[PDB]
Amino acid sequence: MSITETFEKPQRTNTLRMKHGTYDKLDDDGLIAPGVRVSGEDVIIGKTTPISSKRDASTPLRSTENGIVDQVLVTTNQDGLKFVKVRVR
Amino acid sequence: ATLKYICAECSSKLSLSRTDAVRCKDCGHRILLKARTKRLVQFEAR
Amino acid sequence: MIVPVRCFSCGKVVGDKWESYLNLLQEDELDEGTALSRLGLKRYCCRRMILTHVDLIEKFLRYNP
Amino acid sequence: MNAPDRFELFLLGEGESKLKIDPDTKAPNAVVITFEKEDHTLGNLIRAELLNDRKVLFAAYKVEHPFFARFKLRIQTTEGYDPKDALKNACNSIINKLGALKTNFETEWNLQTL
Amino acid sequence: EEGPQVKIREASKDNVDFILSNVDLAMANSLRRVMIAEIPTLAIDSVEVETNTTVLADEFIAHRLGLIPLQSMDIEQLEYSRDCFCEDHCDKCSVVLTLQAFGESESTTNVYSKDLVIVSNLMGRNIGHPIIQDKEGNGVLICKLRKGQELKLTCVAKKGIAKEHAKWGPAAAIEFEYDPWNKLKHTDYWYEQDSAKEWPQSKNCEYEDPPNEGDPFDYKAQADTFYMNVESVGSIPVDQVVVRGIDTLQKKVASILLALTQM
Ligand SMILES: [Zn+2]
Ligand SMILES: [Zn+2]
Ligand SMILES: [Zn+2]
C-alpha cells in the first residue's frame, strides 16, 4: 500500500545503503544505454525501495564479467509491472 | 532528433516521461528498446 | 556468419573469395574441389576455410529489424 | 585478464637492457649474456655463428620459459680471447653474410620476368 | 659474389620460389621466422563505431577490419604511434579511413574493403590503401546489410608487426625444405614395408643427385641449400618480404653490436 520501487539513480538520502559499484554510467531512468562499456561491479541497473526513505536495490554487473551493454528492454508483465532486461555482451 | 527508447517493430524514435506505462504510436507493443549511446565506443582492432 | 577474412592457419586472405567461389559452383557447375583450386586455395588449411564455411549472415539478414 | 601486453615481447620495459653480461663461475673464460626481448631468431642464429670460431670452446643458448621473451647465451673462449669480442665477430659475420644475401637476391630478382 | 647466394625458380605478384645455398640452416631458418613475424606493416588497429544496425556485433566487424590488408610499401617512413610525440595519433604515425555503408536497395547490400576511405594526408607516400587482388575489384567482403541497416565507422591503421598481432603479417605461408633425399639423415622415415615407396617424393629431389646404393654415410656433410617459396598477402611486394626480412634480421643483429658499445 503506497509502497513501490523505482528505477532512478539513487542518491543517499537518510538510508545511504549503496555499494562500491559506480552509478555514473546510469542514466536518469536507471538503465545504462546500449553502446556503453562496463566492468567490475559497475551498476547496470538502479532501483529504490521506500520501506516503512531510500534503501538501494539495484543490480551490479556480476563481479567477474566485463563486456558492453548490448540492448536494454523495458516492458510490463500482466500486473502493469515495469519490467527490465539488460543484456551485456 | 534525440530519443530514449525505440520499438522493436516500427523502430520509431519514441521516448516519454513517467505515467506513460509502455507503448508506441499505434504500435501498442509494450516492449521498447533503449536506443543507443552518444559517446560512441572505441574498439581494439585485435 | 560471414566468410572469414584470412585463413586461420596461414593468413592467405580468404575473405575476398566467398562470392567468386559460390559462382564457380552455380553457373560454371564445377565440383567444390576444382573451384577451390582455381580460387588459388592450394593448401588444405586454406581449403577447409572456404569449403567448411556456413554463411549464416544470410538467415541473420532475413529478420526484419 | 592475467595476460601481458603483446608488445612486451619486443619492447624493453623499465630498467631492462638488451644485454646483461655476468661472468661465469663454473668455467674460466666463460660468460653468460642475457638478451631481453629476443627469442630463438637471434639466439639460435648467434650460437651457430659463434660455433665457427675455433677459439670458441663452448657456445649455447636457452630460453628458460616461453612466457618471457628472453634468453641466455653462454660463451667460453680460449685464454686471451675476450668472449665479448667473440660475440662482436659473430655479429659482424652474421651481417656481412646478410649483406651478400640481400645483394645477391635483389640481383637475381631483377633478371626475373613476371 | 659472396656467401649466401640466390637462384630464383619462379616469381610473381604473390609468389617467389628460390634456392638459398652457402648458408647455415640457422640463417635460412631465422630469415624465415623474421618474415613470418618481424616485418612492419600497416593495419587498422583502432575502430570507433557511430552506427551499427548490422546483424554483426561491433567487435566482430572491428576484428575483420583489422584483418583487411592495406598497402605498406612506404611504412619504413611512417612512425610507430608509441614513438610519435603526438597525443594519440596523427598523419605522422597513422592513416585514418572511414567506412560508411547503408542498405539502400532491397537486394542485400554488400560492404567491401574498397568502401574504405582514407581521410588523413597520405603525404605522398604509398601506404594505407585497401589492397585488392579481386577480379571484380572488391578486396575482401567486410559485411552485409539488409533493407535499411546502417554502419558508420572511422578506422585508424598503425605500423605493426605480427608478434603483436598476426594481422601485421604480410607473409601468408612459407615453403621450407632441404635435403629432399634424406642424404643428411635428419629424419627416420616411418615405413610399413618399404619407406622409399610409401613416402612420396619432393620436386626438390629433381634438383639434387640421388644417393647411390652402396655409398657409406657422409658423416661430414651438413645442411646446405634450402628450397623455399615465399607467399605474399599483398600489403608488400613479394620480393620485398625477402629483402626487408633480411633487412630486419640484419638490423636486429646490428642492435646487439650497438648494445655492446653503449656498454
Ligand atoms: Zn511500434
Ligand atoms: Zn591457409
Ligand atoms: Zn603521431
UniProtKB/Swiss-Prot annotation, chain A:
It is found in: Nucleus. Signal peptide: none annotated. It comes from the Eukaryota. The modification Phosphoserine is found at residue 52. Component of the RNA polymerase II (Pol II) complex consisting of 12 subunits. The binding of ribonucleoside triphosphate to the RNA polymerase II transcribing complex probably involves a two-step mechanism. The initial binding seems to occur at the entry (E) site and involves a magnesium ion coordinated by three conserved aspartate residues of the two largest RNA Pol II subunits. Belongs to the RNA polymerase beta chain family. DNA-dependent RNA polymerase catalyzes the transcription of DNA into RNA using the four ribonucleoside triphosphates as substrates. Second largest component of RNA polymerases II which synthesizes mRNA precursors and many functional non-coding RNAs. Proposed to contribute to the polymerase catalytic activity and forms the polymerase active center together with the largest subunit. Pol II is the central component of the basal RNA polymerase II transcription machinery. This is DNA-directed RNA polymerase II subunit RPB2. It comes from Saccharomyces cerevisiae (strain ATCC 204508 / S288c). The gene is RPB2.
Swiss-Prot record, chain C:
GO terms for molecular function: DNA binding; DNA-directed RNA polymerase activity; zinc ion binding. InterPro entries: RNA_pol_su_RPB10 (IPR023580), RNA_pol_suN_Zn-BS (IPR020789), RPABC5/Rpb10 (IPR000268). GO terms for cellular component: nucleoplasm; nucleus; RNA polymerase I complex; RNA polymerase II, core complex; RNA polymerase III complex. Its main location: nucleus. The keyword Methyltransferase does not apply. Transmembrane segments: none annotated. There is a cross-link at residue 59 (Glycyl lysine isopeptide (Lys-Gly) (interchain with G-Cter in ubiquitin)). One of its GO terms (biological process) is transcription elongation by RNA polymerase I. Signal peptide: none annotated. It holds the Pfam family RNA_pol_N. It is found in: Nucleus, Nucleolus. Zn(2+) binds at residues 7, 10, 45-46. Keywords: DNA-directed RNA polymerase, Isopeptide bond, Metal-binding, Nucleus, Ribosome biogenesis, Transcription, Ubl conjugation, Zinc. PROSITE patterns: RNA_POL_N_8KD. Component of the RNA polymerase I (Pol I), RNA polymerase II (Pol II) and RNA polymerase III (Pol III) complexes. Component of the RNA polymerase I (Pol I) complex consisting of 14 subunits: RPA135, RPA190, RPC40, RPA14, RPB5, RPO26, RPA43, RPB8, RPA12, RPB10, RPC19, RPC10, RPA49 and RPA34. The complex is composed of a horseshoe-shaped core containing ten subunits (RPA135, RPA190, RPB5, RPO26, RPB8, RPB10, RPC10, RPA12, RPC19 and RPC40) where RPA135 and RPA190 form the DNA-binding cleft. Present with 5300 molecules/cell in log phase SD medium. Belongs to the archaeal Rpo10/eukaryotic RPB10 RNA polymerase subunit family. This is DNA-directed RNA polymerases I, II, and III subunit RPABC5. The lineage of its organism: Eukaryota, Fungi, Dikarya, Ascomycota, Saccharomycotina.
Curated annotation (Swiss-Prot), chain D:
One of its GO terms (biological process) is termination of RNA polymerase II transcription. GO terms for molecular function: DNA binding; DNA-directed RNA polymerase activity; protein dimerization activity. Keywords: DNA-directed RNA polymerase, Nucleus, Transcription. Changing residue 108 to G/V: Transcript termination readthrough. It is found in: Nucleus. The keyword Nucleus applies. Its main location: nucleus. GO terms for cellular component: nucleus; RNA polymerase II, core complex. Belongs to the archaeal Rpo11/eukaryotic RPB11/RPC19 RNA polymerase subunit family. Present with 4280 molecules/cell in log phase SD medium. PANTHER family: DNA-DIRECTED RNA POLYMERASE I,II,III, DNA-DIRECTED RNA POLYMERASE II SUBUNIT RPB11. Component of the RNA polymerase II (Pol II) complex consisting of 12 subunits. DNA-dependent RNA polymerase catalyzes the transcription of DNA into RNA using the four ribonucleoside triphosphates as substrates. Component of RNA polymerase II which synthesizes mRNA precursors and many functional non-coding RNAs. Pol II is the central component of the basal RNA polymerase II transcription machinery. It is composed of mobile elements that move relative to each other. RPB11 is part of the core element with the central large cleft. Seems to be involved transcript termination. This is DNA-directed RNA polymerase II subunit RPB11.
UniProtKB/Swiss-Prot annotation, chain E:
Changing residue 7 to E: Transcript termination readthrough. This is DNA-directed RNA polymerase II subunit RPB3. Zn(2+) binds at residues 84, 86, 90, 93. One of its GO terms (cellular component) is nucleus. Component of the RNA polymerase II (Pol II) complex consisting of 12 subunits. The keyword Transport does not apply. It is found in: Nucleus. Its main location: nucleus. The chain holds residues 3 to 265 of 318 of the full protein. Present with 10000 molecules/cell in log phase SD medium. One of its GO terms (biological process) is termination of RNA polymerase II transcription. DNA-dependent RNA polymerase catalyzes the transcription of DNA into RNA using the four ribonucleoside triphosphates as substrates. Component of RNA polymerase II which synthesizes mRNA precursors and many functional non-coding RNAs. Pol II is the central component of the basal RNA polymerase II transcription machinery. It is composed of mobile elements that move relative to each other. RPB3 is part of the core element with the central large cleft and the clamp element that moves to open and close the cleft. Seems to be involved in transcription termination. Belongs to the archaeal Rpo3/eukaryotic RPB3 RNA polymerase subunit family. It comes from Saccharomyces cerevisiae (strain ATCC 204508 / S288c). Keywords: Acetylation, DNA-directed RNA polymerase, Metal-binding, Nucleus, Transcription, Zinc. One of its GO terms (molecular function) is DNA binding.
